[PDB]
Design a protein around this ligand. Structure first.
Ligand SMILES: CC(C)Oc1ccc2ccn(-c3cncc(-c4ccc(C(=O)O)cc4)n3)c2c1
Length: 330
């Protein structure tokens, strides 16, 4: 069978907490009053929810309501518990309230309003400094949630809200997040295809916080190289092929050997043999102003097959790429 793995950091953080912190199945949801909110307009739709701008009529505050499509009570409890545990943490979206439609019995999460600028219009405006700044802000949220025993498991641009005028950022959509427990075998069917870590793609279930760091690396690559998505796979199998064409097959097969991973036979046809590419092949006159030795060194240290060898969030924050950001923040 596969070789076990443990997180290098924050390994036992949940074991040391009271059971109630992580044992979300036992959480009792306190429902507020749906009549306190009036819906104003629809903001967006997902697979599993619809998001509206609303007003809290008790105090006239603008709020956001995420009405859940039908999902298991345990998964709703998980998201609520995680949001409550992380409330007040750096750059974490604040859950303000939880309500039910009395007739249709559908649950709705009520959040703080963030004045988001279209992240699909915000990447053509981003300077080198801006990317470093916002990356640092995301790392603060990830170090925090990891330190609190939580993997986000769905890091990607859609789940980062930015109020550019206020240089404000929030990490949202905790619906896939999970508590880290040493030894636990997780579902690999998480995250968007383009952001999935090698561990997911090869079906290695004993993963950890380091998944988030792969996803972050994918984001960074897409931003500095102006190539969204960076690893553009056609399906989950081809996704690993696209990664292998960059990181190379030698390190991939080393990873599978180290963890005694049983690779789906389907892969044997399509993976082939690929050299590890230098990052210089993605640099061009359009993106060169975003790319530095520091950026490439940092990126290289996020995008590793071996989850254990990726930078931690706290290590990433200490990287020379962020020296200018750190100097200004005091
Ligand atoms: C599906 C959702 C992310 O789509 C949108 C689209 C446009 C906009 C424009 C503003 N928002 C907005 C403003 N303030 C907060 C949020 C929000 C907050 C949390 C979550 C969540 O799940 O955790 C989803 C959305 N959202 C939008 C949300």
């Amino acid at each position: 069978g596969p070789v076990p793995s443990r997180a290098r950091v924050y390994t036992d953080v949940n074991t040391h907490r009271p059971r109630e912190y992580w044992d979300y199945e036992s959480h009792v949801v306190e429902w507020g009053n749906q009549d306190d909110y009036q819906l104003v307009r629809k903001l967006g739709r997902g697979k599993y929810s619809e998001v509206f701008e609303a007003i809290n009529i008790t105090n006239n505050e603008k709020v956001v309501v995420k009405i859940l499509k039908p999902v298991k009570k345990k998964k709703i409890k998980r998201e609520i518990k995680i949001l409550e545990n992380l409330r007040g943490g750096p750059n974490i979206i604040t859950l303000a309230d939880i309500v039910k439609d009395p007739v249709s019995r559908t649950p709705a999460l009520v959040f703080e309003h963030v004045n988001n600028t279209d992240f699909k219009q915000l990447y053509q405006t981003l300077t080198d400094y801006d990317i470093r700044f916002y990356m640092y802000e995301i790392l603060k949220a990830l170090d925090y949630c990891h330190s609190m025993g939580i993997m986000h498991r769905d890091v990607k641009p859609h789940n980062v809200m930015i109020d550019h005028e206020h240089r404000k950022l929030r990490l949202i959509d905790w619906g896939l997040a999970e508590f880290y427990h040493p030894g636990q075998e997780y579902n690999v069917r998480v995250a968007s295809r383009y952001f999935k870590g090698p561990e997911l793609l090869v079906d290695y279930q004993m993963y950890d916080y380091s998944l988030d760091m792969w996803s972050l690396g994918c984001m960074l690559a897409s931003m500095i190289f102006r190539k969204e998505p960076f690893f553009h796979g056609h399906d989950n199998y081809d996704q690993l092929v696209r990664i292998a064409k960059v990181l190379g097959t030698e390190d991939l097969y080393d990873y599978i050997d180290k963890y005694n991973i049983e690779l789906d036979p389907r892969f044997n046809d399509i993976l082939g043999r690929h050299s590890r590419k230098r990052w210089e092949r993605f640099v061009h006159s359009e993106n060169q102003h975003l790319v530095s030795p520091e950026a490439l060194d940092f990126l290289d240290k996020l995008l590793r097959y071996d989850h254990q060898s990726r930078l931690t969030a706290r290590e990433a924050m200490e990287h020379p790429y962020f020296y200018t950001v750190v100097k200004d923040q005091a």
